[PDB]
């Protein structure tokens, strides 16, 4: 979630993803830990049996065969981590991840209840106000001369400067509010 | 918004097609207009008919649960294809086999229910015998008329 | 595989700021100043 | 393979033959797509993180979509044989069907009521 | 409670007839309820009833003298037709309330008899059936715009039918 | 009735003579008090309907509508107080005058004794409503919407004028009491069938029948909030009221002249309810919901049983209140996000928790929650139509399912889901908006307590 | 009698007290969850008294509180029908809700809006009690539909979850498709009997009562999740575990069975209806037990067990055994709620894990929860003399010795064994195998707000069955004479299923790969009913709505036909007439033609 997807994937990335998915499905099939280890070791043996194949056409054919076999043998109901997409409690706490821009509308009497926190927040808003101009210029100057672009953003190069487009990355609500 | 930025009529020439693609933020080669059947689709791009369920779940989409980024061309059937409705996601079993299996199970169940109806299962006993003319009075019968004497024995 | 130097630097900088913000979120001992 | 796609159960990406293409044309295509997406995302993020914003961020895609599903239709409509027949049937035909259903039912009801076969045991409120 | 209009068979509760050494919780709960709740509530109610005895006032059920029916009205004489129509409406809704009372009798009978209702409620079922036949012959198939004239026309249609049947 | 009409007229001098500062407060207050005064029409302790003079009368059918009209005006002023925030004083006073004039004309219409009162005071409503739509509307197509709204109704109405003149020539009068007490059976001549149509068509158009319902989805998504409220709270019911009052003479032709319109209503109800499922404009979705409900009303009225009439009246009132509330809610979110798309704003329950409560209650009224008068009306209409033909339950059930479905779809799409965090401008709910929703809901709850008030003439 | 009626009304007053307190500023200052728990405890205590009165003199009451309205010879009174069904179920529901409302405080301590959660649970309880103690069909409908709304609000309590939102709308779909039949029953019983009151409806026994009882059967199918409209319940576990425990098992889902029990007198004669219910119950039992097996979620397994039990109750009603079916309702309420609470304890103590593959060795680590779970499972598969046995065994006895559809009987027995099989699935994979949870153990069930409620429900599961069975008055003559195999059929099949399940589960430790199997997939994917129906029907309907209705007709053809055709024609005519070249020569030529035409008209008309 913290890195933009590439334009494509190489054989390395595709095969690694297949390895992970097949291992997790093998675990979902083999409930017991010992059985899971027994079969996962065989799975690594199979995967490495063709580790060094320098005829990329045969490599891709092998990968296609592996993927079709995976789709044939995938567990109908796999194991999903509770917070993982498609798992119970995936978004269970998105109700309470209310954003920070709401505090701007608080009544002054409500702000009175929390004096210090809002002073610190005022400092933060001042910092963002200062840094916006420099960070926009930074992105404009770091734009690639060619017409080839990637989602990944630049770091702070100058000194005393916040990283470009940082307000939304920072300040995001806590996972369990 | 102005005319150039709002949709328009079926792209009738390749220069129109390129202008439309630039309007929709779509590639000149990916942009395909709906067939000119005269049903109002007009210029709108024909996007893949895959539900938002299929979109990458881990990505930080601009519009999150919609799972669409800002400026992305929007399918003509987005409301149907949102995560809360139709799901065109791949299935572990082929749709044809799933249909066969479900309908075959239903057929077997109903056929065997008919078999049971035709050939019921019962214990080896006679019908329950009730007294007083099969309770003529207290089973809803007129006092004046006399029911046929229904008798019981040992 | 592995972060680029730019990515590593960016993530470190955002890490520092993120942790400063999270510490900012702490409430001081008197913070729930209940009015009378 | 053994899988057979259906319109409501798409072909999995891994089984998709084209996902494995590595033609330079395909890779150039994908790079250009990513370029468009990155440019759009940068445009969005500038507005998202601008501290001087005072309002929401308008969505050109949403505006275009609604306009296309509303006011562009009739201007981009043309009668055709298929359209005429489909409209005429989908409009009138259901009405004719329900007409015949209700008329036959109510005529049979009136016939029975006239003769006196129907018994209105406790219809008091009708 | 006019027992006539709202008939209520007599009560026939049986003897305590205890056969257990154990104490029945119900009698003691009922004694506690009586003393604790019923007694103060009765005191309050008695106070209210004394307060009512003071400042007593009377209200009288209105009596509506009869007036010519629609049969006595010359066609298009709105002046008399209005009075005939209003009389008919009042009779209509009084009949409605008759039906309500008889239906309430039927429901109370069913509840009272319980599983003997299939025989002991025959009398009230018969009364309900006769009154609903009367109601059907009086006001049924009359449109939402039911009126004395429609009722008269319906009655005359039925009377013509009966006369034909008698002739044949 | 002249103790209710004259104060309404005097509101206008108050509106125009008040100081710029206190004008809104004064008119709102005095309009509430006029609403209070209008309750005198509920002291009907006898079956003899009220006839205050040769000109004005009241009935069990007209009293609830008149009281509803009186109730709406204060709420219309509150709803309009905002979008008129930065207009010049004379323009604001013009708007207020238009609303006051609309109330006056509608009360007079509902309290009119002669159908050629009714035909004039009914069409006089077109001018204020047309001005409200065209002058103060937002988007450009408001002109087209105004044209549709005007001319659909005028084309419907002119044949009504011709039929009414023929009626007067044939009978000698047009006082509804006299027509009722001297009516006579029509014969199935072609000319009589043409009449039946001429009498019924104007009202059917105002009760948009499935084939002539194109002027609501336009008028509503082009009209301001007050225009939408008055329109689809009272104007739509003008058609039903006219139909109810006038059908007395048009018998027995109805038995077979109702098959077409009963069928069109019972089918268009399903079609429009389904349209509500896949519409991307909240205002439009509400408008099509209204079209379906009026389809039910038309079917019941055109079958004419006691249940039909009583349930039709109950549902008329219930829809009035509920649709009004829904439109105020949608306008509430519109005043902030300046868009009418439903998809755009989502998860607003995370920032307007109480207005989410009002949304939920409104959706329940729409979906017909027992024991709400909305349900009671729909249930009794269903009983009537089932008696009329036992097969209508199929259409009724399909419509019930789809009604529940779009009613909950609105809520899930908007109130629930991830908050569109990019919306910085979402501001805390105004006490004005909250009080407006409360004033819409509370009457509904009280009438659900006391349904006897809102039954029709029959029951 | 005063005491009985007063207590009946006081129960509802007490249940409303928390709501009114909620709509006030005192909610902030009081510990609302404890207040509501106390109110529920007191309400249960009050309810006990009418239960004792009924057990003594078995007198049933019709109590008419308020006269809502009179509709031309059809009064609508707020009526209450207190009898065996209503009284016993009020007692049971209050007991189970007391336990679950105390347990909700523990399970939901962290969550904000706990006050709203408690308020919603209470509201549901009021609505369900309205359903049970209802004489008018209209009031029964109030209950029927209000419980549906509360279920919508509680499922997807976490309105963040798109999945939970879909689940709530799924429930509304299926429930409303059910309620169509209910409204049909209402309208038919209004036209043919002119009253919605049960007492008056009773006199329709001599009619056909097919058109109305079909509506009742459909409504019961929808609400109780019988096979036709079953998907809603299993996927209604997206909500909080307390909601699943209370609503969607113990109290709500019994609505269809309760309605059919209430209308037992009318359905005695209509054999068609009774056979239909027999078949439907059998099919649901077998189907949802198949799905129950091979399911890896602790809550979904119990959900499918609940559906199977409800199918069994449907069979119970299919044979003329309404009292026994209701007995099964009440008896299973206890141990189903207990099983849900034990599962909730496990899920909470572990890091919100609900897969039975990442749970193991619980018996050693959480002795109390595992002990109560074992009691619950042994009650679900009625072992002799526990709560289940004092109902399910008699049900199976009547099934095996009543004239019945042979196939229905067979699948019912197989599903009875298969219940043992999946209960073993749970007891094994969640309590017997070596641990599988994440390393950082942090397990605490010592909280009294969890221990005591489960203790109470376990005492219920251990005694209430016998107590109720021995105290209830005679109702249905049971068949007690039968062969040895029929007499002990339930026990032999249940034990055989347990042993088979043990063999199969123990076979998993064998170091061999389990392969994808057609039957395994059919079971796990829930028969494909979701995957197929929920992807074809919504798509087709929604596509039709957009294309055929909104587009083809409303936005195109109607506009062309009525407005735009007129607009065109008039523009054509104005452009035909107005455009005149403007020359006097031509104008006077036209005047000449007018001259001639008037002359001709005069001549011919003479
Ligand atoms: C027999 C007939 C029986 C009929 C029962 C039928 C059952 C139908 C079920 C519907 C389900 C509705 C639902 O789910 O809850 C909606 C709604 C949502 O509640 P919530 O989520 O807590 O809202 C909190 C806000 O989001 C955030 O604001 P908050 O947390 O600060 O709220 C505090 C509290 C504050 O509440 C108040 O201040 C109430 C002021 C009430 C004034 C009423 C004046 C009446 C004038 C008469 C003249 O709650 C409210 O604000 C609610 C205001 C709206 C109440 C309107 C009254 C509805 C009565 C329904 C009948 O809950 C209700 O308030 C409904 C009441 C319970 C249903 C009726 C049960 C019968 C009780 C009768 C006494
Ligand atoms: C030892 C201590 C004993 C403690 C008990 C003490 C009793 C006592 O002090 O004397 C009571 C004493 C009565 O003595 P009484 O001589 O026996 O009564 C004379 C009449 O009966 C007086 O009767 P009333 O006509 O004056 O009654 C006034 C009325 C209050 O109403 C009003 O008058 C209007 C007030 C508006 C206020 C607006 C703010 O109260 C009600 O009748 C209740 C209103 C209706 C609530 C229920 C509505 C249910 C709707 C159902 C919808 C659900 C669907 C149904 C589904 C079923 C059908 C299928 O005074 C009272 O009645 C208490 C005051 C009433 C205040 C109620 C206000 C509620 C609003
Ligand atoms: C022998 C016995 C045979 C019995 C046969 C019975 C046949 C089934 C009858 C029930 C019909 C139900 C049709 C639709 C059910 C449905 O799709 O609702 C749930 C589904 C939720 O999606 P879901 O798959 O659960 O999500 C999983 C994770 N994403 O839904 C969705 O995803 C989106 C739902 C939106 C639907 C809105 C459009 C209306 C849907 C159709 C209404 C049909 C009304 C007419 C019904 C007539 C038949 C009764
Ligand atoms: C049964 C009797 C009742 C039915 C009566 C129907 C009468 C309705 C008359 C509505 C007339 C409105 O007239 C309306 O004029 C506007 C002008 O802005 C036209 O507006 C449109 O015209 C053309 C399309 O043909 C476009 O080029 C133009 O840009 C667009 O605005 C509408 O297409 C037309 O509908
Ligand atoms: C039975 C009598 C009923 C009479 C009631 C109905 C009144 C009819 C009104 C007719 C006039 C409507 O006027 C309507 O004007 C619009 C533009 O404004 C015309 O529409 C026009 O749009 C643009 C130019 O503006 C052109 O591209 C288009 O080709 C042209 O048609 C419509 O074709 C015309 O119909």
- Read out DSSP for chain D? -----BTTBPPPTTT-GGGG---HHHHHHHHHHHHHHHHHHHHHHHHHH-TT--S----HHHHHHHHHHTTTTGGGB---HHHHHHHHHHHHHHHHHHHHHHHHHHHHHHHHHHHT-S--SS----
Q: Indicate contact of B with F: 3+ CB pairs under 8 A.
A: yes
The number of residues in chain B equals 154
- Print burial letters for A123-136: b (CB count within 10 Å at least 16), e (below 16): ebeebbeebbeebe
Q: How far apart are CA F173 and CA B72, in angstroms?
A: 67
Å from CA of G22 to ligand 1 middle: 9
Listed residue (G393, G346, G390, G385) closest to G367, CA to CA: G346
Residues 6+ apart with CB under 8 A from F120: none
Q: Residue G70: which H helix or E strand, with range?
A: strand G61-70
Ligand of minimum distance to the alpha carbon of G136: 2
Of G213, G220, G217, G222, nearest in space to G189 by CA = G213
Alpha-carbon distance of F52 to F96, in angstroms, equals 29
Q: Do F343 and D48 touch (CB under 8 A)?
A: no
Question: To 5 degrees, how large is the angle CA F110–CA F116–CA F117?
Answer: 40
Q: Which approach determined this entry?
A: cryo-EM
Helix H or strand E segment including G481: none
Residue F129 · residue F142 · CB < 8 Å: no
Q: What angle do CA F391, F393, F397 make, to 5 degrees?
A: 145
**CB under 8 Å to G513, separation ≥6 — which residues?**
A29, A30, A39
Chain E touches chain A, with at least 3 Cβ pairs below 8 Å, answer no
Q: Which of E107, E109, E136 to mutate to test the interface with G (most CBs of G within 10 A)?
A: E107
What the block records as the tokens of B25 is 């933020």
Pocket flag, ligand 2, residue G52 (CB < 6 Å): no
- Reduced to 3 states (helix: H, G, I; strand: E, B; else coil), residue G565 is helix
What are D113's two structure tokens? 């009521």
What Å distances lie between residue E136 and D107, D116, D125, CA to CA? 21, 14, 9
Best of F338, F415, F417 to substitute, by most chain B Cβ atoms within 10 angstroms, is F417
Whole-number Å distance between alpha carbons of F183 and G214: 44
Q: How far is the CA of F357 from the centre of ligand 1 (A)?
A: 9
Say whether F351 and A102 touch across the interface (CB within 8 A).
Answer: yes
CA distance E131 to B35: 70
The first and second tokens of residue G44, run together, are 């249960």
User: How many CB atoms neighbour CB G276 within 10 A?
Assistant: 18
CB G336 within 8 A of CB G306: yes
Taking the CA of residue G484 and the nearest CA in chain B, the distance in Å comes to 13
Identify the DSSP state of F234: I
Q: Range of F167's domain?
A: 2-459
Residue with the two structure tokens 């829809």:
F319
Helices (H), chain E: 25-33, 39-53, 78-113, 117-120, 122-138, 148-167
Tell me the two tokens of residue F114: 């002669």
Cβ contact, residue pair D72, B44, below 8 Å? yes
Query: Is residue B64 within 8 angstroms of chain F, CB to CB?
Result: yes
C2 touches chain A (CB under 8 A): no
Distance of alpha carbon A99 from alpha carbon A167, whole angstroms: 12
- Widest pairwise Cα distance in chain B: 102
**A147 at the B interface (CB within 8 A)?**
no
User: Mind giving me the DSSP string for chain A?
Assistant: --SPPPSS--HHHHHHHHHHHHHHHHHHH--SHHHHHHHHHHHHHHHHHTS----HHHHHHHHHHHHHHHHHH--SS----TTSTTSTTSSTTTTS---SGGGGG--HHHHHHSHHHHHHHHHHHHHHHHHHHHHHHHHHHHS-SSS---SPPP---SSS-PPSS-TTTTTPPPS--
Contact indicator for F218, F141 with CB cutoff of 8 Å: yes
Placement of tokens 């998202």 in the chain = D48
DSSP B82: S
CA distance G426 to G289: 13
What's the gap in Å between G567 CA and the centre of ligand 4? 5
- Breaks in chain F after residues (C–N exceeding 2.5 Å): none
Start-to-end CA span in chain A (Å):
19
Distant-in-sequence, close-in-space partners of G431: CB < 8 Å, separation ≥ 6: G360, G361, G362, G363, G370, G373, G374
CB-CB neighbors (< 8 A) of A5 in chain B: 56, 59
Distance between E118 CA and the closest CA of chain B, angstroms: 5
| Of G188, E92, E150, G189, residue with least CA distance to F458 | E92
- C-beta atoms surrounding G472 within 10 Å: 17
* Tokens 């098959």, residue located: F259
Q: H helices of G155-249, where?
A: 162-191, 198-201, 211-224, 241-245
| Rounded Cα gap, residues F387 and E59, in angstroms | 43
Q: Which residues contact C8 (CB under 8 A, 6 or more apart)?
A: none
What is the C-alpha separation between F236 and G227, in angstroms, rounded? Answer: 44
As a whole number of angstroms, the distance between CA A14 and CA A8 comes to 10
H or E stretch at G68: strand G61-70
CB contact under 8 A, B79 and F418: no
Q: Considering only CA atoms, which of A73, A77, B99, B103 is closest in space to residue D4?
A: B99
Query: Residues 6 or more apart from A20 whose CB is under 8 A from it?
Result: none
**Both tokens of residue E122?**
């025959």
At what resolution in Å was this solved? 3.9
Q: What is the DSSP letter of B63?
A: B
* Residue A74 to residue B57, Cβ atoms within 8 A: no
G80 forms beta bridges with G63
Q: What CA–CA distance (Å, rounded) separates F359 from F330? A: 9
**How far is G351 from G361, CA to CA, in rounded Å?**
16
CA of F143 to the centre of ligand 5 (A): 13
Measured CA to CA in angstroms, residue G133 lies from A167, G175, G471 at distances of: 58, 21, 21
Q: What counts of helices (H) and strands (E) characterise chain C?
A: 1, 0
**What is the rounded CA–CA span in Å between residue A162 and residue A132?**
9
Q: How many CB atoms lie within 10 A of CB D24?
A: 7
Q: Is G146 in the pocket of ligand 1 (CB under 6 A)?
A: yes
Q: Measure the CA dihedral G185/G188/G194/G198, to 10°.
A: -30
Residue pair D49/A168 in contact by the 8 Å Cβ criterion: yes
Return the H-helix or E-strand segment holding G66: strand G61-70
Neighbouring residues of G521: CB distance < 8 A, sequence distance ≥ 6: A76, B92, B93
Distance of CA F62 to the CA centre of its chain: 14
Q: What is the torsion angle, in degrees rounded to the nearest 10, for the CA atoms of residue F131, residue F137, residue F142 and residue F147?
A: -10
- Tell me, what DSSP letter sits at residue G545? I
User: Total structural domains in chain F?
Assistant: 1
Tell me the nearest-neighbour CA distance from G40 into chain B, angstroms: 37
- Which residue in B25, B55, B58, B87 has the most chain A C-beta atoms within 10 A of its own C-beta, making it the best mutation to test that interface? B58
Q: At what angle do helices G114-132 and G2-22 cross, to 10 degrees?
A: 150
Distance of CA E102 to the CA centre of its chain: 5
Ligand 5 mean position, distance from CA G565 (Å): 9
Nearest CA in chain D to E161: D114
- The position carrying tokens 């009714």 is F118
Residues from chain F that touch A95, judged by Cβ atoms under 8 A, are: 350
Distance from CA of D45 to the nearest CA of B (A): 9
The separation between CA G564 and the C-alpha centre of its own chain, rounded to angstroms, equals 51
Among G293, G518, G317, G294, which Cα is nearest to G408's? Answer: G317
Which token pair is E74? 């010359």
End-to-end CA distance of chain C: 59
Q: Which residues contact A54 (CB under 8 A, 6 or more apart)?
A: none
Q: Which residues contact D77 (CB under 8 A, 6 or more apart)?
A: B38, B39, B40, D83, G556, G560
Q: Which residue has the tokens 């209520």?
A: E8
What is the widest separation between alpha-carbon atoms in chain C? 59
Which ligand has its closest atom nearest to the C-alpha of G26? 1
Count CB neighbours of G137 within 10 A: 24
Torsion of CA F63, F68, F69, F75, to 10 degrees: 160
- CB–CB of G32/E58 below 8 Å? no
Instruction: Please count the other Cβ atoms lying within 10 Å of the Cβ belonging to residue A173.
Output: 14
Q: Report the interhelical angle of G406-429 vs G271-292 (nearest 10°).
A: 30
Distance CA G149, CA G127 (A): 10
Q: Are G339 and G380 in contact (CB under 8 A)?
A: yes
Q: CB-side exposure of F54: number of CA atoms within 13 Å?
A: 2
Chains A & B: contacts with CB separation below 8 Å: 13
- Of ligand 1's listed atoms, the one at least distance from the Cα of G130 is 1
Is the Cβ atom of F408 under 6 angstroms away from ligand 3?
no
Report yes or no: E139 and E133 within 8 Å, Cβ to Cβ. Answer: no
Q: How far is the CA of G565 from the centre of ligand 4 (A)?
A: 8
CA atoms within 13 A on the CB side of G426: 30
Residues with CB under 6 A from ligand 5: F 151, 155; G 566-568, 570-571
Cis? peptide before D6, omega within 30° of 0: no
Going from the C-alpha of A16 to that of each of A47, A51, A63, F88, the distances in angstroms are 10, 11, 11, 69
Q: Could you write out the three-class secondary structure of G430-475?
A: CCCCCCCCCCCCCCCCCCHHHHHHHHHHHHHHHHHHHHHHHHCCCC
User: Are the C-beta atoms of residues E5 and E101 closer than 8 Å to each other?
Assistant: yes
**CA torsion G568→G571→G573→G579, rounded to 10°?**
-150
Q: What is the DSSP letter of E21?
A: S
The structure tokens listed for F365 are 């009224």
Does a cis peptide bond (omega within 30 degrees of 0) precede residue D104? no
Q: Which residues of F fall below an 8 Å CB-CB distance to E?
A: 47-48, 177-178, 180-182, 247-248, 251, 304-306, 308-309, 457-458
Q: How far apart are CA F25 and CA F23, in angstroms?
A: 6
Q: How far apart are CA F319 and CA F287, in angstroms?
A: 11
Q: How far apart are CA G16 and CA B18, in angstroms?
A: 67
| CA atoms within 13 A of residue G20's CA, in its CB half-sphere | 7
Q: Give the binding-site residues of ligand 4, using a 6 Å CB cut-off.
A: F 144, 147-148, 151-152, 155, 212; G 562-564, 566-567
Element (H, E) at B136: none
8 Å CB contact of G518 and B101: yes
Residue A58 tokens, joined: 């045969």
Tokens of A72: 């044939």
Q: Half-sphere exposure of G479 toward its Cβ, with a 13 Å CA cutoff?
A: 20
Eight-state DSSP code of residue F48: S
Q: Are G294 and A75 in contact (CB under 8 A)?
A: no
Torsion angle of C-alpha atoms G528, G530, G533, G538, degrees rounded to 10: -150
Find where tokens 């043409």 sit: F194
Non-local (6+) Cβ contacts of E14 within 8 A are none
Best mutation site among E119, E120, E123 for testing chain B: the one with the most B CBs within 10 Å? Answer: E119
CB-CB contact of F199 with F248 (8 Å):
no
Structure tokens at B126: 């006679």
Rounded-to-integer distance, Cα A91 and Cα A108, Å: 32
Per-residue b or e along G164-202, where b marks 16 or more CB atoms closer than 10 Å to that residue's CB: bbbbbbbbbbbbbbbbbbbbbbbbbbbbbbbbbbbbbbb
DSSP B150: -
Type and span of the H or E element at F370: none
Tokens read off for D21: 């293409």
């Amino acid at each position: 979630a913290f890195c933009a997807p590439p334009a494509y994937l190489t054989h390395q990335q595709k095969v690694l993803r297949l390895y992970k998915r097949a291992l997790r499905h093998l675990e979902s099939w083999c409930i017991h830990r010992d059985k899971y280890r027994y079969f996962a070791c065989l799975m690594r043996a199979r995967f490495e049996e063709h580790k060094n194949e320098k005829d990329m056409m045969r490599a891709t054919q092998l990968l296609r065969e592996a993927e079709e076999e995976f789709w044939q043998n995938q567990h109908p109901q796999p194991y999903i981590f509770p917070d993982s997409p498609g798992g119970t409690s995936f978004e269970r706490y998105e109700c309470y991840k209310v954003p920070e821009w709401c505090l701007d509308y608080w009544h002054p009497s409500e702000k009175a209840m929390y004096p210090d926190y809002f002073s610190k927040r005022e400092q933060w808003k001042k910092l963002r106000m200062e840094s916006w101009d420099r960070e926009v210029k930074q992105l404009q100057e770091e734009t690639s001369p060619d017409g080839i672009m990637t989602e990944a953003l630049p770091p702070a190069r100058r000194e005393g400067d916040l990283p470009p487009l940082w307000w939304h990355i920072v300040t995001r609500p806590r996972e369990r509010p | 918004m102005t005319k150039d930025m709002l949709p328009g009529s079926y792209p009738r020439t390749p220069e129109e097609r390129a202008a439309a693609a630039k309007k929709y933020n779509m590639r000149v080669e990916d942009y395909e207009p709906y067939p000119d059947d005269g049903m109002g689709y007009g210029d709108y791009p024909m996007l893949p008919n895959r539900s938002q369920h299929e979109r990458d779940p881990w990505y930080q989409w601009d519009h999150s649960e919609l799972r669409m980024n800002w400026g992305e061309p929007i399918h003509w059937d987005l409301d149907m294809y949102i995560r809360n409705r139709v799901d065109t996601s791949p299935t572990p079993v082929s749709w044809d086999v799933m249909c066969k299996h479900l309908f075959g199970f239903v057929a077997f169940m109903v056929f065997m229910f008919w078999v049971g109806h035709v050939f019921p299962s019962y214990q080896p006993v006679g019908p329950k015998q009730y007294p007083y003319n099969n309770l003529y009075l207290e089973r809803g019968g007129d006092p004046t008329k006399e029911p046929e004497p229904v008798v019981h024995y040992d | 595989s592995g972060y680029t130097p730019d990515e590593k630097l960016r993530l470190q900088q955002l890490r520092e700021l993120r942790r400063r913000w999270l510490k900012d979120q702490e409430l001081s001992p008197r913070e729930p100043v209940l009015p009378p | 393979s053994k899988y057979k796609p259906a319109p409501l159960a798409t072909l999995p990406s891994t089984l998709d033959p084209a996902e494995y293409d590595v033609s330079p044309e395909t890779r150039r295509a994908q790079v250009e797509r990513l370029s468009i997406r990155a440019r759009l995302k940068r445009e969005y993020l500038l507005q998202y993180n601008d501290p001087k914003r005072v309002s929401h961020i308008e969505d050109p895609a949403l505006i275009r979509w609604t306009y296309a599903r509303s006011a562009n239709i009739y201007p981009n409509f043309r009668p055709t044989p298929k359209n005429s027949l489909l409209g005429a049937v989908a409009g009138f035909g259901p009405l004719i069907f329900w007409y015949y259903v209700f008329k036959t039912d109510r005529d049979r009801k009136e016939r029975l009521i006239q003769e006196g076969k129907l018994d209105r045991k406790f219809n008091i409120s009708y | 409670w006019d027992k006539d209009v709202y008939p209520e068979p007599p009560s026939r509760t049986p003897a305590p007839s205890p056969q257990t050494s154990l104490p029945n919780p119900i009698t003691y709960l009922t004694k506690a309820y009586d003393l604790v709740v019923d007694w103060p509530v009765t005191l309050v109610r008695e106070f209210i009833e004394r307060q009512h005895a003071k400042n007593r006032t009377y209200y009288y059920h209105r009596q509506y003298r009869r007036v010519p029916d629609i049969t006595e009205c010359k066609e298009g004489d709105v002046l008399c037709i209005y009075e005939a129509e209003m009389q008919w409406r009042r009779d209509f809704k009084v009949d409605q309330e008759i039906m309500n009372i008889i239906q309430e009798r039927l429901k109370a009978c069913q509840q009272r008899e319980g599983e003997n209702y299939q025989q002991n409620c025959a009398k009230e079922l018969e009364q309900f059936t006769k009154v609903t036949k009367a109601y059907q012959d009086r006001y049924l198939d009359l449109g939402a715009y039911y009126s004395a004239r429609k009722c008269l026309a319906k009655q005359k249609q039925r009377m013509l039918e009966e006369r034909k049947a008698a002739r044949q | 009735m002249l103790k209710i009409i004259l104060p309404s007229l005097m509101l206008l001098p108050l509106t125009w003579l008040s100081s710029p500062k206190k004008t809104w407060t004064n008119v709102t207050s005095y309009s509430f008090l006029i609403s209070l005064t209008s309750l005198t029409l509920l002291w009907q302790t006898d079956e003899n309907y009220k006839n205050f003079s040769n000109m004005f009368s009241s009935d069990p059918l007209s009293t609830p509508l008149i009281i509803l009209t009186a109730w709406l005006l204060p709420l219309m002023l509150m709803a309009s107080q905002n979008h008129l925030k930065k207009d010049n004083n004379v323009l604001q006073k013009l708007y207020i005058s238009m609303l006051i004039s609309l109330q006056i004309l509608l009360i007079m219409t509902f309290s009119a004794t002669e159908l050629i009162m009714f035909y004039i005071l009914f069409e006089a409503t077109l001018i204020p409503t047309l001005i409200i739509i065209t002058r103060w509307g937002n988007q450009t197509e408001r002109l087209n919407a105004g044209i549709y709204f005007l001319f659909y109704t005028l084309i419907g109405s002119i044949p009504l004028l011709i039929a009414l003149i023929l009626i007067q020539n044939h009978v000698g009068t047009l006082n509804l009491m006299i027509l009722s007490f001297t009516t006579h059976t029509l014969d199935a001549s072609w000319s009589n069938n043409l009449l039946w149509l001429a009498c019924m068509m104007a009202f059917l158009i105002k009760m948009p029948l499935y084939g002539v319902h194109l002027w609501l989805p336009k008028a509503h998504v082009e009209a301001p909030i007050a225009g939408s409220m008055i329109l689809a709270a009272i104007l739509l019911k003008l058609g039903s009221y006219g139909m109810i009052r006038i059908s007395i003479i048009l018998d027995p032709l109805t038995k077979y002249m109702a098959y077409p319109f009963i069928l069109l209503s019972l089918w268009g109800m399903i079609m429009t309810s389904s349209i509500c499922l896949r519409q991307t404009d909240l205002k439009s979705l509400i408008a099509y919901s209204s079209v379906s409900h009026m389809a039910l009303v038309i079917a019941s009225i055109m079958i004419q049983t006691p249940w039909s009439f009583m349930g039709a009246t109950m549902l008329m009132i219930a829809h009035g209140l509920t649709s009004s509330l829904l439109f105020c809610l949608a306008n509430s979110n519109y005043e902030r996000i300046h868009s009418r798309t439903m998809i755009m704003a989502r998860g607003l329950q995370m920032v307007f928790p109480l207005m989410a409560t009002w949304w939920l209650m409104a959706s329940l009224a729409n979906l017909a929650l027992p024991p709400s008068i909305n349900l009671m009306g729909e249930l009794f209409i269903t009983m009537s139509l089932f008696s009329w033909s036992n097969f209508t339950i199929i259409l009724m059930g399909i419509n019930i399912i789809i009604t529940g479905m779009y009613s909950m779809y609105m809520i899930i799409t908007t109130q629930r889901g991830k908050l569109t965090n990019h919306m910085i401008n979402l501001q805390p709910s105004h006490t004005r908006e909250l009080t407006l929703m409360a004033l819409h809901m509370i009457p509904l709850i009280l009438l659900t307590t006391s349904p006897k008030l809102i039954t029709g003439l029959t029951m | 009698m005063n005491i009985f009626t007063t207590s009946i009304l006081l129960i509802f007053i007490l249940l409303l007290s928390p709501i009114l307190i909620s709509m006030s500023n005192l909610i902030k200052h009081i510990n609302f969850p404890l207040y509501t728990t106390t109110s529920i405890k007191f309400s249960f205590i009050i309810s006990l008294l009418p239960l004792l009165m009924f057990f003594h003199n078995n007198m049933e009451y019709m109590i008419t509180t308020w006269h809502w309205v009179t509709m031309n010879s059809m009064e609508l009174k707020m009526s209450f029908k207190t009898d065996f069904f209503s009284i016993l179920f009020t007692s049971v529901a209050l007991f189970v809700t007391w336990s679950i409302m105390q347990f909700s405080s523990w399970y939901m301590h962290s969550d904000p809006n706990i006050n709203r959660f408690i308020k919603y649970l209470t509201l549901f309880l009021i609505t369900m009690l309205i359903l049970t103690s209802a004489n008018n069909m209209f009031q029964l409908f109030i209950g029927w539909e209000g419980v549906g709304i509360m279920s919508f609000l509680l499922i997807g309590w976490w309105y963040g979850r798109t999945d939970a939102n879909t689940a709530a709308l799924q429930a509304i779909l299926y429930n409303r498709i059910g309620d169509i039949g209910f409204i049909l029953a209402m309208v038919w019983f209004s036209l043919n009997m002119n009253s919605w009151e049960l007492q008056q409806i009773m006199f329709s026994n001599n009619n056909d009562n097919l058109i109305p009882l079909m509506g009742l059967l459909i409504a019961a199918t929808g609400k109780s999740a019988q096979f036709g409209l079953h998907p809603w319940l299993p996927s209604a576990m997206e909500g909080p575990t307390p909601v699943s425990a209370l609503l969607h098992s113990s109290t709500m889902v019994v609505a269809g069975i309760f309605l059919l029990v209430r209308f037992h007198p009318l359905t005695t004669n209509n054999n068609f209806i009774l056979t239909t219910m027999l078949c439907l119950g059998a099919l649901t039992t077998l189907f949802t037990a198949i799905c129950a097996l091979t399911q890896n979620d602790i809550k979904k397994i119990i959900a499918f067990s609940t559906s199977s039990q409800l199918g069994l109750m449907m069979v119970t009603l299919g044979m003329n055994q309404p009292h026994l079916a209701f007995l099964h309702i009440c008896t299973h309420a206890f141990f189903k709620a207990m099983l849900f609470m034990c599962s909730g304890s496990i899920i909470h103590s572990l890091a919100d894990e609900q897969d039975i593959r990442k749970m193991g060795n619980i018996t050693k680590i959480m002795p109390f929860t595992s002990s109560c779970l074992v009691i619950g499972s042994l009650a679900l598969t009625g072992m002799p003399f526990l709560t289940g046995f004092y109902s399910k065994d008699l049900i199976i006895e009547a099934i095996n010795t009543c004239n019945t559809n042979a196939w229905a009987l067979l699948i019912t027995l197989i599903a009875t064994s298969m219940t043992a099989m999946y209960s073993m699935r749970i007891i094994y994979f969640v309590t017997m195998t070596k641990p599988r949870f994440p390393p950082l153990i942090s397990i605490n069930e010592n909280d009294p707000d969890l221990m005591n409620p489960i203790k109470r429900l376990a005492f219920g599961s251990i005694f209430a069955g016998f107590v109720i069975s021995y105290n209830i008055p005679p109702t249905s003559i049971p068949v007690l004479t039968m062969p040895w195999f029929l007499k002990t059929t339930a026990l032999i099949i249940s034990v055989l299923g347990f042993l088979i399940a043990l063999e199969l589960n123990n076979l998993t430790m064998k170091l061999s790969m389990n392969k994808a199997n057609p039957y395994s997939s059919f079971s796990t994917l829930l028969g494909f009913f979701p995957s197929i129906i929920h992807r074809i029907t919504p798509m087709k309907s929604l596509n039709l709505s957009l294309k055929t209705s909104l587009t083809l007709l409303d936005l195109i053809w109607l506009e062309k036909t009525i407005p735009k055709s007129t607009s065109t024609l008039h523009t054509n005519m104005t452009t035909l007439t107005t455009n005149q070249k403007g020359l006097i020569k031509l104008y006077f030529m036209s005047f000449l033609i007018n001259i001639i035409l008037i002359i001709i008209l005069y001549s011919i008309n003479l």
